[PDB]
Design an enzyme around this catalytic site. Structure first.
Site, PDB file in Angstrom:
ATOM      1  N   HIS A  68      -2.161  -5.815  10.172  1.00 34.68           N
ATOM      2  CA  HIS A  68      -2.126  -6.949  11.102  1.00 34.68           C
ATOM      3  C   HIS A  68      -3.516  -7.314  11.616  1.00 34.68           C
ATOM      4  O   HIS A  68      -3.775  -7.322  12.812  1.00 34.68           O
ATOM      5  CB  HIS A  68      -1.170  -6.665  12.267  1.00 34.68           C
ATOM      6  CG  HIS A  68       0.260  -6.586  11.859  1.00 34.68           C
ATOM      7  ND1 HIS A  68       0.885  -5.365  11.653  1.00 34.68           N
ATOM      8  CD2 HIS A  68       1.125  -7.581  11.558  1.00 34.68           C
ATOM      9  CE1 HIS A  68       2.119  -5.654  11.271  1.00 34.68           C
ATOM     10  NE2 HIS A  68       2.311  -6.977  11.201  1.00 34.68           N
ATOM     11  N   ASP A 111       4.728 -15.473   7.233  1.00 39.39           N
ATOM     12  CA  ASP A 111       4.467 -14.141   7.739  1.00 39.39           C
ATOM     13  C   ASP A 111       4.795 -13.053   6.753  1.00 39.39           C
ATOM     14  O   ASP A 111       4.076 -12.055   6.682  1.00 39.39           O
ATOM     15  CB  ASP A 111       5.216 -13.914   9.059  1.00 39.39           C
ATOM     16  CG  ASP A 111       4.633 -12.807   9.899  1.00 39.39           C
ATOM     17  OD1 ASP A 111       3.445 -12.450   9.677  1.00 39.39           O
ATOM     18  OD2 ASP A 111       5.352 -12.292  10.776  1.00 39.39           O
ATOM     19  N   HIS A 143      -1.122 -16.132  15.215  1.00 34.31           N
ATOM     20  CA  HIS A 143       0.195 -15.499  15.394  1.00 34.31           C
ATOM     21  C   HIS A 143       0.191 -13.994  15.643  1.00 34.31           C
ATOM     22  O   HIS A 143       1.174 -13.500  16.185  1.00 34.31           O
ATOM     23  CB  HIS A 143       1.170 -15.845  14.250  1.00 34.31           C
ATOM     24  CG  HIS A 143       1.072 -14.929  13.068  1.00 34.31           C
ATOM     25  ND1 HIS A 143       0.041 -15.038  12.160  1.00 34.31           N
ATOM     26  CD2 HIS A 143       1.845 -13.882  12.725  1.00 34.31           C
ATOM     27  CE1 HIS A 143       0.202 -14.047  11.303  1.00 34.31           C
ATOM     28  NE2 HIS A 143       1.275 -13.322  11.597  1.00 34.31           N
ATOM     29  N   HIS A 158      -4.832 -10.901   7.311  1.00 31.15           N
ATOM     30  CA  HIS A 158      -3.424 -11.291   7.393  1.00 31.15           C
ATOM     31  C   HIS A 158      -3.297 -12.671   8.029  1.00 31.15           C
ATOM     32  O   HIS A 158      -2.546 -13.500   7.541  1.00 31.15           O
ATOM     33  CB  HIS A 158      -2.619 -10.239   8.200  1.00 31.15           C
ATOM     34  CG  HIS A 158      -1.209 -10.644   8.529  1.00 31.15           C
ATOM     35  ND1 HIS A 158      -0.257 -10.808   7.540  1.00 31.15           N
ATOM     36  CD2 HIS A 158      -0.627 -10.860   9.731  1.00 31.15           C
ATOM     37  CE1 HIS A 158       0.870 -11.105   8.165  1.00 31.15           C
ATOM     38  NE2 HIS A 158       0.695 -11.169   9.483  1.00 31.15           N
TER      39      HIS A 158
HETATM   40 MG   LIG Z   1       3.524 -10.236  14.490  1.00 33.44          MG
HETATM   41 ZN   LIG Z   2       2.092 -11.463  11.049  1.00 35.34          ZN
END
Ligand SMILES: [Mg+2]
Ligand SMILES: [Zn+2]
EC number: 3.1.4.17
Length: 310
Positions: free
Chosen positions: A67, A216, A105, A71
């Site tokens: 993360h 995502d 995000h 990403h």
């Molecule tokens: Mg997340």
């Molecule tokens: Zn993510």
């Protein structure tokens, strides 16, 4: 008149859903600006403000295995590929808002799930009972937009600014996978009964939420060598969280237990069958040009089936 240009191979492959942004971190801001310029226009943002917004966002991502900043840019690229293949369906504010929502995000993610923060009794879990990390990522986004010289939406009216921030808020909250299950069931019902209406704001929010989940999870839609290498980074985070659960005196779920490394291929099959395949199937029904994501996802599912069979 300062248009961004990419080398020939990148210019061509950046249009494909399975594009990999590469290992050169210093090229990722330029790749993002290129996507913004082609997606909504060279005029939607003032370049100086956009570049300083991007560098502050980068600075607020952490050095975690999965993360991280890479990403964030990979998720924004999947959104770029969806918007480019469904050009007539989205408003000017949605195009602006969604690329920024994808870049922000996972802002300030520490590599831990919402369940771990709850069991640890982290202050963020008291501040936000549900979608703990996602409410924090949106809060971090607002903080960066309020820094001097960082308001990339300064030419929008008070009304339009509130609308774009509302698009961003809902898009970021939708990245909480716990909310995805019910969202995809509602969308599947509306689509099959013919009641899905893209002119209804409430239905648009659901479709945008499913696009956020699809972007995502896009590591499962790359070519097998990329998908297989990204799984190591994903599990390096899961295993560290499992270790932290063991330190709290709680046995982690097998997926997060590094002593159950042998169960990874079977756990991946469960994920594609229960999460990824349904997500890309419902997304292709609503947005037919997103079919390459479902096709690549099915290819990776059969590659994982080959792993289990030696
Ligand atoms: Mg997340
Ligand atoms: Zn993510």
């Amino acid at each position: 008149l300062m248009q961004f240009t990419l080398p020939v191979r990148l210019c061509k492959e950046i249009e494909l859903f399975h594009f990999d942004i590469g290992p050169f971190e210093n090229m990722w801001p330029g790749i993002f600006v290129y996507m913004v310029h082609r997606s909504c226009g060279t005029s939607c943002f003032e370049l100086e403000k956009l570049c300083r917004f991007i560098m502050s966002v980068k600075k607020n991502y952490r050095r975690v295995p999965y993360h991280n900043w890479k990403h964030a840019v990979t998720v924004a690229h999947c959104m770029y590929a969806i918007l480019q293949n469904n050009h007539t369906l989205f408003t000017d504010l949605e195009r602006k808002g969604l690329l920024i929502a994808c870049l922000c995000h996972d802002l300030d993610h520490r590599g831990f799930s919402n369940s771990y923060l709850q069991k640890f009794d982290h202050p963020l879990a008291a501040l936000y009972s549900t979608s703990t990390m996602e409410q924090h990522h949106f809060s971090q986004t607002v903080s960066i937009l309020q820094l001097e010289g960082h308001n990339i939406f300064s030419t929008l009216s008070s009304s339009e600014y509130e609308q774009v921030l509302e698009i961003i808020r809902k898009a970021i909250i939708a990245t909480d996978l716990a909310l995805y299950f019910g969202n995809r069931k509602q969308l599947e019902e509306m689509y099959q009964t013919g009641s899905l209406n893209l002119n209804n704001q409430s239905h648009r929010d659901r479709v945008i939420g499913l696009m956020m989940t699809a972007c995502d999870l896009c590591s499962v839609t790359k070519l097998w060598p990329v998908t297989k290498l990204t799984a190591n980074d994903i599990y390096a985070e899961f295993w560290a969280e499992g270790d932290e659960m063991k330190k709290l005196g709680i046995q982690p779920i097998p997926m997060m237990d590094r002593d159950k490394k042998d169960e990874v291929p079977q756990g991946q099959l469960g994920f594609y069958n229960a999460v990824a395949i349904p997500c890309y199937t419902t997304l292709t029904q609503i947005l037919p040009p997103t079919e390459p994501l479902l096709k690549a996802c099915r290819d990776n599912l059969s590659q994982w089936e080959k792993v289990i069979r030696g």
